[PDB]
RNA sequence: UGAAACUGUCCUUAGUGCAGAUCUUGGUGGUAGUAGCAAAUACUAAGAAGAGGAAAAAAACAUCUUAGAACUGAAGAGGAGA
């Protein structure tokens, strides 16, 4: 589980969806230490539906 | 170094000697990798093409298709004329 809120915490509005996708790319990396990070389709439509 | 013309003495002649004219024309510096590249709400994921996202996050990646999210808001960022 990501806790986004602490990432996007009076983060720049019209940055804010953007942002998550960075953050969650960043944590793959130091997780899995790959640099070849894919998001799936729905993954990135959900962060979107707001 | 350069590869085809030139020099010394005597007279004669003159478009004859430059550091300045905010001189004329051409070239080049320090400033300086500095000031900037900030109006018009806004981009993201997958794939294709390409030499052109690599990587100890080098955090950003132009074009096209699909999906998401959006703006002009019909006296329009639409469709047409002088």
Not at 17 to 42: C, E, N, Q, Y
């Amino acid at each position: 589980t990501i806790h986004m809120h602490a990432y996007l915490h009076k983060e720049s509005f019209k940055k804010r969806a953007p942002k998550a996708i960075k953050i969650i790319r960043f944590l793959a990396i130091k997780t899995m230490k790959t640099h070849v990070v894919k998001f799936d389709m729905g993954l990135n439509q959900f962060i979107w539906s707001q």
